[PDB]
Amino acid sequence: XXXXXXXXXXXXXXXXXXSLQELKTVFPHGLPPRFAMQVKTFNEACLMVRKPALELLHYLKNTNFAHPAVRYVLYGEKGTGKTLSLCHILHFCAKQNWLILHIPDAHIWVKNCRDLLQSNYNKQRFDQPLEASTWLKNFKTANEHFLSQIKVQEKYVWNKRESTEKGRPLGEVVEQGIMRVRNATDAVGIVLKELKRQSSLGIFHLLVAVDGVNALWGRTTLKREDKSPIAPEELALIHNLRKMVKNDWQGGAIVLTVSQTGSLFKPRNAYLPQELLGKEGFDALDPFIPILVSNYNPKEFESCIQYYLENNWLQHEKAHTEEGKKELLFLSNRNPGQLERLCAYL
Amino acid sequence: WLIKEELEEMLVEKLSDQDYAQFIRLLERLSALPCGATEEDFVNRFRRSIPXXXXXXXXXXXXXXXXGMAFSRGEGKRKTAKAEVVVYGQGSGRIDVNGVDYLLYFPVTQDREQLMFPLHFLDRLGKHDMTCAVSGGGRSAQAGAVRLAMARALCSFVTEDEVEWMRQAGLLTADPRVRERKKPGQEGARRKFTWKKR
Ligand SMILES: Nc1nc2c(ncn2[C@@H]2O[C@H](COP(=O)(O)OP(=O)(O)O)[C@@H](O)[C@H]2O)c(=O)[nH]1
Ligand SMILES: [Mg+2]
Ligand SMILES: [Mg+2]
Numbered sequence A: 001x002x003x004x005x006x007x008x009x010x011x012x013x014x015x016x017x018x019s020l021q022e023l024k025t026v027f028p029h030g031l032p033p034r035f036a037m038q039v040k041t042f043n044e045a046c047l048m049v050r051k052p053a054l055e056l057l058h059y060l061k062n063t064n065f066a067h068p069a070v071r072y073v074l075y076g077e078k079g080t081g082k083t084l085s086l087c088h089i090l091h092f093c094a095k096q097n098w099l100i101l102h103i104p105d106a107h108i109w110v111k112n113c114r115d116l117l118q119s120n121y122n123k124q125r126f127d128q129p130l131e132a133s134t135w136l137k138n139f140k141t142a143n144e145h146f147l148s149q150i151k152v153q154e155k156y157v158w159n160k161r162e163s164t165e166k167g168r169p170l171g172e173v174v175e176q177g178i179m180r181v182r183n184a185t186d187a188v189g190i191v192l193k194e195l196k197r198q199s200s201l202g203i204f205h206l207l208v209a210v211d212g213v214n215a216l217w218g219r220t221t222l223k224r225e226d227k228s229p230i231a232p233e234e235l236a237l238i239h240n241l242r243k244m245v246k247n248d249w250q251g252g253a254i255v256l257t258v259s260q261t262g263s264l265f266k267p268r269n270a271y272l273p274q275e276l277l278g279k280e281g282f283d284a285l286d287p288f289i290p291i292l293v294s295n296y297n298p299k300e301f302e303s304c305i306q307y308y309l310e311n312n313w314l315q316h317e318k319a320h321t322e323e324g325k326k327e328l329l330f331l332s333n334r335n336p337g338q339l340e341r342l343c344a345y346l
Numbered sequence B: 001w002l003i004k005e006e007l008e009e010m011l012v013e014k015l016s017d018q019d020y021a022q023f024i025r026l027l028e029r030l031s032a033l034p035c036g037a038t039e040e041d042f043v044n045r046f047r048r049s050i051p052x053x054x055x056x057x058x059x060x061x062x063x064x065x066x067x068g069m070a071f072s073r074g075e076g077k078r079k080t081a082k083a084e085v086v087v088y089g090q091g092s093g094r095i096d097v098n099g100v101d102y103l104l105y106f107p108v109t110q111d112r113e114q115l116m117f118p119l120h121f122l123d124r125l126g127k128h129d130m131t132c133a134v135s136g137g138g139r140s141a142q143a144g145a146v147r148l149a150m151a152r153a154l155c156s157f158v159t160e161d162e163v164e165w166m167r168q169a170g171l172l173t174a175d176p177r178v179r180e181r182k183k184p185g186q187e188g189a190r191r192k193f194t195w196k197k198r
Helices: A020-026 A033-042 A051-061 A084-095 A129-142 A145-149 A170-179 A184-198 A236-242 A273-285 A298-310 A322-332 A336-344 B004-011 B017-031 B037-045 B109-122 B139-153 B160-169
Strands: A015-018 A045-048 A070-075 A099-103 A117-119 A125-127 A155-157 A163-165 A206-211 A252-257 A289-292 B070-078 B081-088 B095-097 B129-135
Touching: A015 A020, A020 A045, A020 A084, A020 A129, A033 A045, A033 A336, A045 A298, A051 A070, A051 A084, A051 A289, A070 A273, A084 A099, A084 A206, A084 A252, A099 A129, A117 A184, A125 A236, A129 A170, A129 A184, A145 A170, A163 A170, A170 A184, A184 A236, A298 A322, A298 A336, A322 A336, A322 B109, B004 B017, B017 B037, B070 B139, B081 B139, B109 B139, B109 B160, B129 B139
Parallel strands: A070 A252, A070 A289, A099 A206, A206 A252, B095 B129
Antiparallel strands: A015 A045, A117 A125, A155 A163, B070 B081, B081 B129
């Protein structure tokens, strides 16, 4: 299927490609691991375009940066393809030369943190250096041009012996937060608040993409040495990140996603926004655009099969028949994540 | 021919196997020649007749009043698990289980394969639309019950010939296999406490 760049309407269910340098540039952060497999396997980065992706992109074409920050939501069944329908957006508006703030899984913040550091600067907030540092190290390669341009107007204190005073390029702040890892989180929050402050200017076009928003108000796994569980409130990273969904600001766009897979305490089958977010989440999330994500339709499906045949990735003999199509259709219920797996061993 | 017990009843006489055998042997000699009228009557005395019946019983279809459409409702039962499956003759391929989709209700691939069996057999895979209610037991048991119920509800919409195929595929026959009760003084109904020679 034929393509050039992300935005075309009639190209629904066609194959968009990107380069490897385009890939290291646009997704320094994680790309969905199954798809990183796809890419490292086929040497080619390839994708198809879906009706919700089209819809979302056309909403992003009509955007007014004078208007307050607009929230979007991608919801759907497990492995229904909602995290990649985030990346479509990502490289589109990154090729439009915007600020791309991408957190691939919020859940990695709320769960499995080796080192919980206590910081009372923020009045009982905990910082997670491991995550902060990784996130910053990707964000560096994310947007390079914009990092030297931004001039932060603030005074900031890292240490008694260390400080940075206003008139500094932002990239400086970032890489100085990476070098000294213990305070990396503080620098993350700082980068964040000043990002939102500078978004008032026409220099910042901000796309804030947080996948697994449910993590923000959800119940947390991490614990104090008293065995007492800690709120999502108590996390420096999260407390600061909620501030970035708040719709208080201009020039930005926030695309969001509600996961099942990475979540905590939620049942396996709940793909509906109000469940995953809960009361606090939904309420604190304000009017948003609830974009449903669903299974491949027949056309997208025979398209996916077309594509897999094209790469000779189906190595089974009888895979070429209409028989093979009917089998894979019925076993997958033509679900993107399911078909991915049915082909992997086929 | 009569059993030994039936000749014993006919003559009001205890018999021996050898004797019975001798006689029946003689009746074969009789049948071996040209058969007269009274000859045939004579051997008819010692004749009996037996029934044999094999067909999978075919339910006439049922046309629903609401859409004016025909459906067939099957019931499978396997191993603590019963399932009921209503199959609609004009489908989108939709298959619903207990009010949720079949992919979600059988995350185990194996199960979905079991489900696929009858439909892939009869090449009807997209053609039919099924509603399903299943209860009892664990997942494989359930998927198998649905297999039986479905393959039963699929013989209204199939040809009279494909039926004998589904029999020889073993789709419509229940699974007699079930758990065997532990026995007291043993372990696992078969497994025994370790036996000691000394
Ligand atoms: N061809 C194609 N594949 C996709 C697309 N979106 C997702 N996939 C694949 O389908 C799988 C499921 O997508 P994902 O967003 O991770 O589902 P999630 O687990 O519900 O978030 C991924 O491994 C992708 O490789 C798409 O737009 N086109
Ligand atoms: Mg996901
Ligand atoms: Mg045992």
